[PDB]
Amino acid sequence: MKASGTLREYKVVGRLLPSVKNPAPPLYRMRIFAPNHVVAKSRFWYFVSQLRKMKKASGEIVYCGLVFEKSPLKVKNFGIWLRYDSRSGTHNMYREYRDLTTSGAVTQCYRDMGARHRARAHAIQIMKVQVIAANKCRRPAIKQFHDSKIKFPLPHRVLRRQHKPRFTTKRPNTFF
Amino acid sequence: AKSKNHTTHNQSRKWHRNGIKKPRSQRYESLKGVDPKFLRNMRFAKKHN
Amino acid sequence: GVDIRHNKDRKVHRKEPKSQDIYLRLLVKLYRFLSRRSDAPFNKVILRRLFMSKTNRPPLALSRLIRKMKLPGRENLTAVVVGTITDDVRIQNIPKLKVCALKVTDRARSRILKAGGQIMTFDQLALTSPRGRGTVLLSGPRKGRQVYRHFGKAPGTPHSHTKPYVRSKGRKFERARGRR
Amino acid sequence: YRREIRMSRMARKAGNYYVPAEPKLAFVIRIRGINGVSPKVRKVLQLLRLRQIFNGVFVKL
Amino acid sequence: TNTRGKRRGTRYMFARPFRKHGPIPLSTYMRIYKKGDIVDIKGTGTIQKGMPHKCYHGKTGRVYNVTQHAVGIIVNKQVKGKILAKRINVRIEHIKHSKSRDSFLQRVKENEKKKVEAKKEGTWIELKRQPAAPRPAHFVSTKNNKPQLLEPIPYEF
RNA sequence: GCUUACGGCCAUACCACCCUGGAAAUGCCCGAUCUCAUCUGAACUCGGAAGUAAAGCAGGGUCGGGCCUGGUUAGUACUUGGAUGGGAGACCGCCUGGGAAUACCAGGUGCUGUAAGCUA
RNA sequence: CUCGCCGAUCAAGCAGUUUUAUCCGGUAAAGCCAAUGACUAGAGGCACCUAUUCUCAAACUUUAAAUGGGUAAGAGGCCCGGCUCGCUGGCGCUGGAGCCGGGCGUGGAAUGCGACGCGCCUAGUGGGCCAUUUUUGGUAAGCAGAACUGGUGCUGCGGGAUGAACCGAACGCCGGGUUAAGGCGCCCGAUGCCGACGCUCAUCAGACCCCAUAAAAGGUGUUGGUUGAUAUAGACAGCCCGAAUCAACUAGCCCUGAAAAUGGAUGGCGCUGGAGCGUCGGGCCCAUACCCGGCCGUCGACGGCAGCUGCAAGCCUCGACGAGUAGGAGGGCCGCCGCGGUGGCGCCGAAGCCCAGGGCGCGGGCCCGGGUGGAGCCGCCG
RNA sequence: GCGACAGGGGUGGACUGUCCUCAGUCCGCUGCGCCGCGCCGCCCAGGGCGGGGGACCCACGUUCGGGCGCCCGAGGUCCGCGGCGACGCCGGCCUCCCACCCGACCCGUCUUGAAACACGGACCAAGGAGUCCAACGCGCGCGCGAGUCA
RNA sequence: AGGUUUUACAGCGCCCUCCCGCCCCGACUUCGCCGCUUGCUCUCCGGGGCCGCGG
Ligand SMILES: [Mg+2]
Ligand SMILES: [Mg+2]
Ligand SMILES: [Mg+2]
Ligand SMILES: [Mg+2]
Ligand SMILES: [Mg+2]
Ligand SMILES: [Mg+2]
Ligand SMILES: [Mg+2]
Ligand SMILES: [Mg+2]
Ligand SMILES: [Mg+2]
Ligand SMILES: [Mg+2]
Ligand SMILES: [Mg+2]
Ligand SMILES: [Mg+2]
Ligand SMILES: [Mg+2]
Ligand SMILES: [Mg+2]
Ligand SMILES: [Mg+2]
Ligand SMILES: [Mg+2]
Ligand SMILES: [Mg+2]
Ligand SMILES: [Mg+2]
Ligand SMILES: [Mg+2]
Ligand SMILES: [Mg+2]
Ligand SMILES: [Mg+2]
Ligand SMILES: [Mg+2]
Ligand SMILES: [Mg+2]
Ligand SMILES: [Mg+2]
Ligand SMILES: [Mg+2]
Ligand SMILES: [Mg+2]
Ligand SMILES: [Mg+2]
Ligand SMILES: [Mg+2]
Ligand SMILES: [Mg+2]
Ligand SMILES: [Mg+2]
Ligand SMILES: [Mg+2]
Ligand SMILES: [Mg+2]
Ligand SMILES: [Mg+2]
């Protein structure tokens, strides 16, 4: 997996190939986060292949479509259960994020695991993503944003557009 | 002054250069090696028909 | 670049008679006009053989020409051969042949003409039979040279039957160790 | 184009699914060069008529 | 350098299967090998007479000569870069009939009857094998098999 | 269904112990003149028919051992091909395909060809 | 050279490839409570004996892959009738094989291709080296020896500062466009984006295939994470106070561990809201690579010709292609000397020699002009 | 409509169990397939398909064919135009000299590997190395041909 | 945790609904919150560079 851009949520369902001994085999639904449907189908045959005895050639994908966010205009507190393989061993991990859509929250998990734990895209395995209420948040980095009437300035505004005027007589101000 | 003893490195590239041709199976295969008792009678079945 | 082997791009086919003969190159200029416009498969075979060498144009004895004319269906056809029609002295009768060849030996020319036959050339053949109709194109024993008796597997292998290169065929010449 | 939409809509209406037929045509594009190719892979690229880089052919699936 | 012995490396190929030792079952002796049938080659360590060479164990050739106790086979052996047709004499205890052509003969006999049946009925049944075509479009019902949610399991050591 | 002769596959047929069965047949059994035979009529060979199921043999029994088959072990172990993947390294993860084995659990236990005879 | 050229008008056959079908094996793994061999520990039954248990095999194996090897996918077939034999024998068909005649294309898997068809002569070479994987001897080696494939030798080009082999890509002469690998602070073409998020301070920071070194063990440096224990029946810290606290473990970056000799090396400068590390987006930069067009040449054609040409050994049209040492072949209106033909030139200046002169040919070379020179010289066909 | 099964009664019997003329085992609704019918569902005329009862589209309108033009049509032309034109104010870009940017290590040779701290080479001119004879092989040209070569 | 206890002197969810109670905007290239494309996407539809060789 490459984790390019925003990871979109795909609902990939699949089943074994129907035979005369087992007609209409059970259908298995999966919650896949992948940049496109081509990778989402491959991610399906990675977890289902290790949970049930069924490969890509022994089964088929019945449906693979996008799952849009029901409330893209509401700030939500997400909780992601994952397990990444470090250089020593595999570790379970529960991290909390906060975004408008679940597609962007899992994307932050791949950026955070790579930044803090140097974990690549192929080592992370998302297990559970759940919209957690503001009472069950365990991380203090999100609980500080759970204060109504929140107030904070923007101190020391670093100058961007450093090359629109590349030479000038005025030194930039950082208090606004 | 030792040298290299044995190698089959470039041999597979030389074999398929002019291709590995199967033996030409011709119609009316030969009759060498057949049972002499069987061939002696078969030559008697050709000089009497 | 492209993945292709240029090992056998050139097709080694003689497209011009290697001889500097004048009359032979005039027949080439004649049958090249027929191989392009006559649209007859006969002229395309005569054109090849006008290029071939002497070893690829072996002689055609009278007996070997008479037997191929006596086959059923060769009543009043012509015996075309790109080469010399040598005489076979060990034959007796000539059954009214109608031949057409580059060269004919003096005795073969006499025995064909005395029997009432007719001898033509490739310029007269292209005049009376441009499409090549009513012709029987023959050839000589190309594998009949003494040179081909030395070609094979090797003189010193089982089931060879290959003639070895020796100075003189005698008793003390390659018969001691390996031939018995 | 309108038939595959009809079949997919009548399957979602009843809560079922409609698996479209697997494609029968493929467009193969060679992307790698011609130097350093395995002999088993080089033989297949010749049977697909893909001998140089960035050329395409249609393949029945 | 290795030895050029005739039975070097044949410790396992000429051995007999587990609990399959003893005398040869008498069905391999009463099989008729005509001249021109495809036979396999599989040496046996029980009969040390007329056994094939290790370069033919597992190969397959056609019969060109039949004798009292053995059968002459024409096997194609690649030496270095050339394939040569070898005429070997192997007894009937090391060979067996090859079923590689029986699937072809059964397919021909079924083809010779399909065209005479279509000719006297007026149909256009195609007599030609085709590779596995892509699966057609089909509906997958979820009436009694609802999709079960799968997800990765936590790591346990 | 059964009893014999000759078999094919060669334990689903073998092994231990227990129980039941003789219509035909089979087996045990009864003899040493002949044929033959050994230290010894035990065996082998030969002659025979008083007894009829102790054994052979056949059919059942065993939460039987073995064998056979399936499930599971497991899409695990291993592996084809790929990367300017990770790692000081050892080695590991992933992509694309193939894909085992023991243990454990469950079921089964001879089938069948030719010829002859008997209805326990 | 024999054909096919006309595409499955045709028979085809072939393949460093798959598919279908059928065989071969004893390597990886697995097993040893199964055999051979090695091996630890208790327990039961009177040192053995039985049922278990820990750990192994390259010269052990019940079982057993992946990759891989052979064969079969049609007219050389299928089917039917007759005949022949000294072979075979209960059985003029009992087998068998041969011969002759007739019936039957829906060429009876995918893809590709003119057959790498049939011969002849034959140079060079017979010191190799490197890489991914497999693997032997060795502590190890830029060491020695093997296996599959690729590369190199014989090979330039873009990238890795530098380079034989690494990555990308193979080469006729050019214009335009676009990429690969790799890059875009400046050297140095391109981020002079109001790029996204987070980690990180180093009194030896770090800066990415091969690759040019670093370990065990540690940190109350800092940031995540896992599992527990205390606490308004008031803990922790402090000598009562009244809200969170403690411990173990784990993983990132940084640090200790970390010492060599001429002055020096992320390539250099230098960079610390970065020009560092990790995960990603958009744009942009150029290779002899891809695309379009011009030109040269070679190759092929199921090719075109008996106002302008037709030196047919000529002319014209179309398509693909172009690396190269050892070596082979072809072409030469390239060059030197001499001979037989032929066509000339020269004291109004031949040969030779010199040149900042005018030109032709891809090239070997050639023509003309000027100067000098003073007696011979050259073109074409052989 | 009919096939795979599920649950019990009556009759006979074989077997099993240390509960013993007491117990137990056994033998003689729901699922799939297959069609036929009804109803409902598919921008809605079902936009899945074919037929029946105001403007846009029809290589349909009574069979084609024939003159003049245009041109997204077998690879370009202008039936457009300006300033300079006397050896100078124009032209040559190859050669000569010089400058700058990029590239760029010395050839030959042996070698796996040479710019090599491997060898030969200070410079210039002339000379300087695959030949001729005998015999053999194959290919090709030519003459004649069971002959041929004097 | 707005107002003095859960709507009150702001608001935030979740259910039964009144036909989806009812209308209007359709990934916004059609008014810059988020994907995939023609079912031959439409334009004497604009602008720039390059060269038209042959006959
Ligand atoms: Mg990845
Ligand atoms: Mg050597
Ligand atoms: Mg040696
Ligand atoms: Mg080599
Ligand atoms: Mg490469
Ligand atoms: Mg040895
Ligand atoms: Mg009894
Ligand atoms: Mg048992
Ligand atoms: Mg099993
Ligand atoms: Mg054929
Ligand atoms: Mg040698
Ligand atoms: Mg040699
Ligand atoms: Mg090196
Ligand atoms: Mg080595
Ligand atoms: Mg060495
Ligand atoms: Mg090469
Ligand atoms: Mg470097
Ligand atoms: Mg360019
Ligand atoms: Mg750079
Ligand atoms: Mg310490
Ligand atoms: Mg502390
Ligand atoms: Mg405490
Ligand atoms: Mg350090
Ligand atoms: Mg082009
Ligand atoms: Mg070349
Ligand atoms: Mg001379
Ligand atoms: Mg039924
Ligand atoms: Mg040297
Ligand atoms: Mg030397
Ligand atoms: Mg040096
Ligand atoms: Mg010197
Ligand atoms: Mg000289
Ligand atoms: Mg020679």
UniProtKB/Swiss-Prot annotation, chain A:
One GO-annotated biological process of the protein: cytoplasmic translation
Pfam families per record: Ribosomal_L18A
Gene3D superfamilies named in the record: 3.10.20.10
UniProt keyword annotations, A-Z: Cytoplasm, Ribonucleoprotein, Ribosomal protein
Coiled-coil regions listed in the entry: none
Function: Component of the large ribosomal subunit. The ribosome is a large ribonucleoprotein complex responsible for the synthesis of proteins in the cell.
HAMAP family recorded: Ribosomal_eL20
UniProt subunit comment: Component of the large ribosomal subunit.
Name of protein: Large ribosomal subunit protein eL20
